Each structure stands twice: as structure tokens, then as C-alpha cells.
């Protein structure tokens, strides 16, 4: 049997915790129950053998960078998380969530994920961002940042609709496989 520790790192302004618990909920779209707990963990196979999968919820708060550098050591993988239609999430990740995680452990498989891909092409939210002079992070932007850091895989899935979410986590589990 195997147990994987994964410190999920990303801003709380995007509320990736909803996505994480929804997957732990394995819910029907929009029918999950968010909770009061942190660091939601579970046990699901992808192939051959199920894994004690541990998704450490380090919220977007930067202050917790006092004991998140304890979470970084001895952690099997890491989930670095941003939103494709929240440009502030993009730059915050590349400035705090990408570098702090990268440098606390420059030797660990790292997976950049673009949240709100459903809204990356959302005409209303995109026209708001343009009115808010915010650039909708397209696939090439994340592709370039990934090849910049060489993340073991860069992804973009859905939270409210769970799309690619299961696949994203499947490659997350097979990452150590």
C-alpha cells in the first residue's frame, strides 16, 4: 500500500477548496458539500493499486508560509493552482505560489492547473476582464509558464462541472506511477 502527500498550493481567491472537496465528495456536479476541514485526503486507484492520496489544503493565505515550508519537505508531489480567468491568480502564482513552492523544494514533481477554464472562454466574464483590463490567461500562457518551470504537467480543468477534474486527478495519482 502507498500514501502520497501533496501540498496543494494556490490562492484562496479562486476557492480551489471547493473543487478539491467536490472531488473528495466525488459529487454530482454542484451537489458536493464543502466542509470545515483542511487538507482533504482520500483513497482512489487509477491503475493496479489504490493509493492513500493526501491533498494538503494550504489556503491562499501567504502568512501560513511559516509552516508550509514544513509541508514542502517530505511531500511526494505538489498541486500548484491558478485560475485562467483570474489574472491576479496567474501573477500571484508566478510570484508567490510558483516560486515559494519551487524553491522550498526544487526537486519534486509539480503540476500547474488552470482553474475556471469554463470561464476562460466565458464571453461575459471575458468581456468583464477586458473592461477590467484583465487578460484571460489562454492555453499558450500556461504552456509557456510550464515550459518555463518545467512542471511535470500543466493542466486546466473544471470545478463546478468536474470536467477534466477526474482526469486531472487521475494523472495526479499516476504521477507517482
Amino acid at each position: 500500500m502507498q500514501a502520497i502527500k501533496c501540498v496543494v498550493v494556490g490562492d484562496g481567491a479562486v476557492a480551489k477548496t471547493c473543487l478539491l472537496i467536490s472531488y473528495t465528495t466525488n459529487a454530482f456536479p454542484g451537489e458536493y458539500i464543502p466542509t470545515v476541514f483542511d487538507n482533504y485526503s482520500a483513497n482512489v486507484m487509477v491503475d493496479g493499486k489504490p493509493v492513500n492520496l493526501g491533498l494538503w489544503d494550504t489556503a491562499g493565505q501567504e502568512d501560513y508560509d511559516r509552516l508550509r515550508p514544513l509541508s514542502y519537505p517530505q511531500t511526494d508531489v505538489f498541486l500548484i493552482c491558478f485560475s485562467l480567468v483570474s489574472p491576479a491568480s496567474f501573477e500571484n502564482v508566478r510570484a508567490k505560489w510558483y516560486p515559494e513552492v519551487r524553491h522550498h523544494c526544487p526537486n519534486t514533481p509539480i503540476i500547474l492547473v488552470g482553474t475556471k477554464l469554463d470561464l476562460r472562454d466565458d464571453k461575459d466574464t471575458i468581456e468583464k476582464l477586458k473592461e477590467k483590463k484583465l487578460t484571460p490567461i489562454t492555453y499558450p500562457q500556461g504552456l509557456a509558464m510550464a515550459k518555463e518551470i518545467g512542471a511535470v504537467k500543466y493542466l486546466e480543468c473544471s470545478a463546478l462541472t468536474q470536467r477534466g477534474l477526474k482526469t486531472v486527478f487521475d494523472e495526479a495519482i499516476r504521477a507517482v506511477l
Binding site: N26, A27, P29, E31, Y32, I33, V44, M45, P50, K166
Partner: protein, 254 residues
């Protein structure tokens, strides 16, 4: 199934009716000898079927018949040594709990039995509901479902172009007899958390109250989807219908 056949037989000393005198082999074949053959094979199955509870539960009266009629003392002893093996397997070996799904094939397009009825499915030990619905798409044409996870699809109650709906339902607990008072070790429970299961349910989070941001709790209601399966899980068939479905409600206090 083999038991069900043996269930017909009696430990009688004689070859009684040639109807049960099978066609694979044929000679005198006294009834107790046939039950003996059958019980050998059944226990072999259960051993390779990991269901040593059943193995022992039969091996008991097997040795009983041995001594009581035949004095198969060699068979007595070896049978009991196998019973010991089973008990050791029980305490030692651990078993996984299959995910459970009450499955609604909706669509007049399904056959008469396959339409509009919630079939509770005993999947594999660690099934993902998505891959389950995937093989349903392998199972049937018209690979499309209801997002109506909780309510039925009335249109596709009588519509063609079969739809579907599924989710991982709750394996309702088994009832370990005379163990509730008893500080039994875990092995019984682990063996009982997903087997011998006929009642089932799936979660229905609901928002009945004031949906303020911080509190999800004065609104949170679970319309538990109670199920009854016509037959034991595990049983003669992996899946089964729901014998009776029941919705529920859960108050903000509850």
C-alpha cells in the same frame, strides 16, 4: 448456484430420483454422496471466492454428516483443518468494499425489464462511478444520461433514446448477529461493511434555509435516498434492482 442445486438435495442415504442424476457422470450416486461432491466444490469455490464465512458455516454440518453417518474420519480431520485455514484467513486477511450504485436505465428504448427501473449494482471493490457509467455506455447504445441524479427522467420514462443515471450509493451496514453486545475484533465488521448488504442510499445535499455565505448549515438538508435490494450483496447476481427506494430529509440540526 451450485448450492441452490444442493439445496434441493437431501443428505439421504440413497440415490432417489434420476432427474438430479446428472449427465456429466452417472452411476449409483446416493444422495448424501452427491451433497458430498457438491459441498466439496462449494467449499472450494468459497475458498477461492474468499467467502470463508460460508465455507465454515457449511463445513460444520459437513463434518456433522461425516461422523453422524459415514465416519469419514479422514475427511472429518482434513475438512476441519481447512476450517482452521479459513478462520486464519478471516482474522488475518483483509477485504475491500465495493462501491455500490442504484442504477436507473431510463428510456422506452430499453427492454421492458431494462427500462425505468433502479437496478442496484454491486460494482468492483474500488469502482469509480464515472467508469461505471462508462461501461453502461459500453453496455448500451445511446450513451447519454440524466443530470437528474436525484429525480427520475419522466420524459425518458417513455421516450426512446435510452438515458441513464448513476452514483455511488451508501453500502448500508450489515448486522453481525449477537456481535453488537460483543467487543468483537474488527475482522467481522470489515467483512460486514460491504457484504450481505441490501439497503442502500445516496447523498442528496440540499439548501433549505437562509443561504448565508459563511453558514451552509441552517440550509443543509440531506434527502437520503434509501434503497432496498431484492437480494443480498453479494448474491447470485452482481447487480440487482432496488426492491424499494425511499427519499429522506435531514434538518439543519440533524
Amino acid at each position: 448456484t451450485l448450492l441452490l442445486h444442493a439445496e434441493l438435495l437431501q443428505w439421504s442415504d440413497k440415490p432417489c430420483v434420476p432427474h438430479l442424476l446428472q449427465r456429466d457422470s452417472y452411476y449409483v450416486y446416493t444422495q448424501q454422496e452427491l451433497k458430498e461432491k457438491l459441498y466439496q466444490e462449494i467449499i472450494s469455490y468459497f475458498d477461492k471466492g474468499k467467502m470463508w464465512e460460508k465455507a465454515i458455516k457449511l463445513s460444520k454440518e459437513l463434518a456433522e454428516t461425516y461422523e453422524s453417518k459415514v465416519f469419514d474420519y479422514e475427511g472429518l480431520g482434513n475438512l476441519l483443518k481447512k476450517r482452521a485455514s479459513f478462520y486464519e484467513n478471516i482474522i488475518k486477511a483483509m477485504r475491500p468494499q465495493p462501491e455500490y450504485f442504484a442504477v436507473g436505465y431510463y428510456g422506452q428504448g430499453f427492454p421492458s425489464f431494462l427500462r425505468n427501473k433502479i437496478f442496484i449494482y454491486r460494482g468492483k471493490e474500488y469502482e469509480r462511478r464515472e467508469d461505471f457509467s462508462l461501461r453502461l455506455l459500453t453496455q448500451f447504445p445511446n450513451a447519454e444520461k440524466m443530470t437528474s441524479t436525484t429525480p427520475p427522467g419522466e420524459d425518458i420514462k417513455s421516450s426512446p433514446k435510452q438515458y441513464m443515471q448513476c452514483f455511488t450509493v451508501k453500502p448500508v451496514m450489515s448486522l453481525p448477529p449477537s456481535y453488537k453486545d460483543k467487543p468483537v475484533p474488527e475482522q467481522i465488521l470489515n467483512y460486514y461493511r460491504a457484504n450481505e448488504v441490501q439497503q442502500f442510499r445516496y447523498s442528496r445535499p440540499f439548501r433549505k434555509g437562509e443561504k448565508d455565505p459563511d453558514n451552509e448549515f441552517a440550509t443543509m438538508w440531506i434527502e437520503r435516498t434509501t434503497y432496498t435490494t431484492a437480494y443480498t450483496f453479494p448474491g447470485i447476481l452482481k447487480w440487482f434492482e432496488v426492491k424499494q427506494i425511499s427519499t429522506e430529509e435531514i434538518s439543519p440540526l440533524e
